[PDB]
Amino acid sequence: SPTLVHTLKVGFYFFLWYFFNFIFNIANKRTLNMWKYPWVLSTIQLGVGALYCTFLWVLGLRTKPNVSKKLIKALIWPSLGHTLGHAATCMSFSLVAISFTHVVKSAEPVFGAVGSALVLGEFFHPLTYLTLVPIVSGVALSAATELTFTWTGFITAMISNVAFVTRNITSKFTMVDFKNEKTLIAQNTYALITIISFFMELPFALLMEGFPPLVSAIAGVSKAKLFGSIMFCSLFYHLYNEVSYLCLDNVSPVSFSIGNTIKRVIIIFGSILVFRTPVTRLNFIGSTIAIIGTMLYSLAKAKLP
Amino acid sequence: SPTLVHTLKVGFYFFLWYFFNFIFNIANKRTLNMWKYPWVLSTIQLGVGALYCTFLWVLGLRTKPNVSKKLIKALIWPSLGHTLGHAATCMSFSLVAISFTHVVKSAEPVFGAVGSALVLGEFFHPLTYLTLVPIVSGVALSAATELTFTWTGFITAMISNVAFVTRNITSKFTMVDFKNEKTLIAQNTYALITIISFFMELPFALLMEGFPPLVSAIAGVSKAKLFGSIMFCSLFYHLYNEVSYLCLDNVSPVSFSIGNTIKRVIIIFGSILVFRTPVTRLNFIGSTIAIIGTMLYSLAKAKLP
Ligand SMILES: CCCCCCCC/C=C\CCCCCCCC(=O)OC[C@H](O)CO
Ligand SMILES: CCCCCCCC/C=C\CCCCCCCC(=O)OC[C@H](O)CO
Secondary structure, three states: OHHHHHHHHHHHHHHHHHHHHHHHHHHHHHHHHHOOOHHHHHHHHHHHHHHHHHHHHHOOOOOOOOOOHHHHHOOHHHHHHHHHHHHHHHHHHHHOOHHHHHHHHOOHHHHHHHHHHHHHOOOEOOHHHHHHHHHHHHHHHHHHHOOOOOHHHHHHHHHHHHHHHHHHHHHHHHHHHOOOOOOOOHHHHHHHHHHHHHHHHHHHHHHHHOOOOOOOOOOOOOHHHHHHHHHHHHHHHHHHHHHHHHHHHHOOHHHHHHHHHHHHHHHHHHHHHHHOOOOOHHHHHHHHHHHHHHHHHHHHHHHOO | OHHHHHHHHHHHHHHHHHHHHHHHHHHHHHHHHHOOOHHHHHHHHHHHHHHHHHHHHHOOOOOOOOOOHHHHHHOHHHHHHHHHHHHHHHHHHHHOOHHHHHHHHOOHHHHHHHHHHHHHOOOEOOHHHHHHHHHHHHHHHHHHHOOOOOHHHHHHHHHHHHHHHHHHHHHHHHHHHOOOOOOOOHHHHHHHHHHHHHHHHHHHHHHHHOOOOOOOOOOOOOHHHHHHHHHHHHHHHHHHHHHHHHHHHHOOHHHHHHHHHHHHHHHHHHHHHHHOOOOOHHHHHHHHHHHHHHHHHHHHHHHOO
8 A cells, every 4th residue: 555655646746747737838828929938938937936946945945955066067967958948848839839839749758768778778679660650650740730830830849859858867867866965855956957047048038039028919918917927827837847856756767758748648638628729630640640659669668678 | 802703793783773773763754754654654664574584584594493382472572562662652753753752762771770670689779769860850851842742752652661671671581591492593583573563563553544545645755655665664674673683682681772772862863963853952951961861870770789
C-alpha cells in the first residue's frame, strides 16, 4: 500500500501539472488574442514567477537555496533551454492555433530519447526508425490541413522541442548532482531557472517589442481586464512549470517528455472545445497518427535492447 | 593489383550504371511527355528487358540459369519490390519534374540502412537521428518550393524508396545463397526478376489504363517516332538496371543505395538542364541540404558502431 500511495502522490503532481497548464494555455491564448506581444508577455511570465519565488524565500515560506557559483554555472544551460523554448512556444502561440503548437510539441519524446541516449551512450533499435514514419507523416498531414498554419508558427514550435529537452536533461543532471543538498528542492531548482531566464530574455524582449502599450486589440475590453488577464496567465504559467519540476524530480527526462505528450492530448482536446477550433477529418487523423507514433516510438525504445 | 583490377572493373560498372540511367531518364521523361501512361509504359519497359534477355539465352550469348523451385521462391520478394518501385517511380515521373522525383529518392540510403540493420540486428548511434534533421528539412523545403509538386507524385516516389530497398536486400540474400550456382551470374538474377516483374505488373497495367492509343500528345510526332521512343527508353531502362545488379553483386545493399544517391545528383543536374526546369533559390537550397544530410547520415552510420 505505501508504495501505491507514493505513486498516488507522484500522480497527483502530474494532475496538478496538467490542471495548471490547461488553465494557463486558455488564459495565455486569450491574452495573446488581444495583446499580440509574445516576447514581452513571455518575459513578464518569467518575471512574475521570479517575483513570486523571492517572496516565498523572503517570507520563509520556502527553504532558501544554498546558492553557489558551481550551482549557477550548472543552471545556465537549463536556463538557456528554458528561455529559448519559452520564447519560441509563445511566438508559436501568437501565430497559430495553440492546438497546432501542441501537436508539433507532441513529438518531444523523440527529441528527448535522442538527447538522453546521446548523453548516456545508448543505441537505438532499428524499429524506432520504423515508428518515425507515422510521426513524420502525421505531423506533415496535420500541418498541411491546419487552417491557421504558418511556417514560422510551425518552426518555432519545433525548435521548442529541442530547447526544452536540453533543459530537462541538464536540469536532471543538476538535481542529481545536488541531491544531497537538502535546500535545493525541486521548486528551488525551477525558481533559480525562472530568475536566470527572466534576465536572459529581457534584453531580447525589449529590443524586438519595446514597451507595448496596454491596449486591447479586441474593442470593448478595458485596460483593467487586459492587465488582469496578463497577471492571471503569468501566475498559472509559473505554477504549472513549478509543479512540473516536482514531476521531473521523480522520473527520467524521457518519462517527463512522455508525460508532456499526455498533457498535450488534454490541452488539444480542451483548447479546440473552448475556442471552437475548426478541425477537419484529415487534420484529426494526421494529429492522432503523429501522437500514436511517438508513443509507439517510446514503446519501441523502451522494450528493445 | 588483383584487388585493384577488381575495383577498377567494379568502378566501370558504376559508370555504365550512371551513363545508361541518364540516357534512360531523359528518354523516359520525353516519352511520358508524349504518352502519359505510366502503368503501361513501365510494364512495356520490363517486357522489353524480358525479351532482350531471352534472346541472349536463345542465341547462346549468355549462360542460361538453372531455374529451380527454390530459386523462383527466392525471387518473388525481389520481384515484388522491383515491380512496386518501378510502377511507383514511373507514376511519379509522369506527375512531377523527374528532378524532384530523384530528390525524394535521394533519401534511399536511410531506408537502406534501416532495413539492413533490421535484418542484421544492428543498432543505430544517436548521432544518426541528428542527421535526419537536414534530410527532413531539406526534402520539406524542396517539396514546398517545387513548382510541379503534387502529393501523389511525392508519395509514390517516397514509396519507391521502401520497395527498392526491399528488392536490393532480398536480391542480395538470393545472390549470396545461390553463389555456388555457377549459372546464376548477376545478369541472370536480374533477368529472372524482370521476367517475373513483367507478369506481376501486366494485369494491373491493363486494369489501370487499358490499351492506350499510340498517339503522341505533342504535335509533329508520328506513331513510328513515338514507338521508337518507347523502345529506346525501354532498352536503356533494362541496360542500366542490368549493369546495376553487377554493382549490387559486388557491394552491400547500403553501399548500393549510397551509389544511387550519387547517381541522382548527376540525373538531377542533367535533367534540369535538358528540360530547362525552373529552379528557385530556396528549392536548390532545400534539395542540396536534403542530399547533404543523406551523405552525413551515411557517414555517421558507417563511422560509428
Ligand atoms: C521525430 C520528430 C518528428 C517531427 C518532425 C515532423 C516532420 C515534419 C516534416 C515536414 C513538415 C513541414 C511541411 C509542412 C507540411 C505542409 C504544410 C504546408 O506547408 O502548407 C502550406 C501552407 O499552408 C502555406 O503557407
Ligand atoms: C529519411 C527521411 C526521408 C525524407 C522525409 C521527408 C519528410 C518531408 C515531410 C513532408 C513533405 C511534404 C510536406 C511539404 C509539402 C508542402 C508543399 C505543398 O503542400 O504545397 C501545396 C501544393 O502545391 C498543392 O498540392
